[PDB]
Design a protein around this ligand. Sequence first.
Ligand SMILES: O=C(O)/C=C\C=C/C(=O)O
Ligand SMILES: O=C(O)/C=C\C=C/C(=O)O
Lengths: 215, 212
Amino acid sequence: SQTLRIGYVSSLLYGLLPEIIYLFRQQNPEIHIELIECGTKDQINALKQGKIDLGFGRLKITDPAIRHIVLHKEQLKLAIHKHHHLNQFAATGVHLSQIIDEPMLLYPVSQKPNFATFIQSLFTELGLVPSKLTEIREIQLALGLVAAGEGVCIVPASAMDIGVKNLLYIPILDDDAYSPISLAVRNMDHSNYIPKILACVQEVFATHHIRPLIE
Amino acid sequence: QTLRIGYVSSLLYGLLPEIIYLFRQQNPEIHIELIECGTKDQINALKQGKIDLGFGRLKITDPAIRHIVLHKEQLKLAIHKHHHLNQFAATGVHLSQIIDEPMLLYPVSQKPNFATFIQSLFTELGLVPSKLTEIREIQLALGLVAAGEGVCIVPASAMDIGVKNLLYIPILDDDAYSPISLAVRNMDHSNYIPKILACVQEVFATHHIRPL
Ligand SMILES: O=C(O)/C=C\C=C/C(=O)O
Ligand SMILES: O=C(O)/C=C\C=C/C(=O)O
């Protein structure tokens, strides 16, 4: 009997992660499981300290003690209210240099590096300096607020299915406009539950026909 | 004016944002701040003037606070799509029949909260659940359900929270509803109160009627 403790960023609950856990549970019934919400940075510390054994996240934080496997690179979308003047680019899509002056929401509020600093790093890379930014606690608030008419917000593709009403998700046409889904584990951790969970990720992935091999 | 509004996270998946968006269009001169805040914590925030309106799912009585029930919303049992209760997707189930199901409550917050509300529904019917687990908040509860860790009673609007591979079984008991109430300072007669209720109506009536 092993209690495997898994860290996750919230937006992954709307993708394939729950299936992967479900699959893992059915295949490994003796291994009990706990899920904890925490940012990618906090997972490094959680992992290092042994608070969690696996970390599913959105950022590659390089570190001696941490082995980091990129699972899938997911396109980014700009979330808007359905009446916002960027409607017209629903089909074609937008470059980030076209919305530098738009009131924008970043998320989450957390110890850096965040998904917030990930986006700001994308702006820097693309020579862009956003004039109107606001930080919001977590993703569902951000989207709620976009629906409430408080600006636009860059999110990953799988945020589309979240359930907040009256939104549109404009494609982002930039080359670097992708958010990597990754699994962080302890470099020294040689437990069998690591390759097992990786087997599940691949099994689910293959069923959904998104199957380049990981690693 | 700077109007400050308290809300619970699940409401963001329903009509509330439309209500805010509408109010914001009709009253452009009024600035708005939205703050996450449990229904219990709303009582104290109102008293302090920390917030002006509270949007919650419980009717916590208090001399200082007026509860305006906006909508009584049906509760549903969230289950994994292969869970043995999927037989009852059409017919629905009773709370007396799920007392022994591994159950997830939420959130983890100062009580009374939605967790104590759900617990009181069983207590009210003389039922005592054999396996309960408190979970931080709704998204995780449903994620866990899809992960195969149990069942979770949730309001109807939770159906649209797009956690994959779930079914939402009707709950047949008469008491099995969650009231969505507006909490305000008792004697507060600001004109944003009637205005916000007007916006609630307009959004409600648009959806009670439309779309085709
Ligand atoms: O995906 C989300 O919903 C939130 C945060 C993601 C990464 C981070 O904070 O490092
Ligand atoms: O609605 C939710 O998502 C959670 C809690 C609601 C009310 C409360 O805790 O008082």
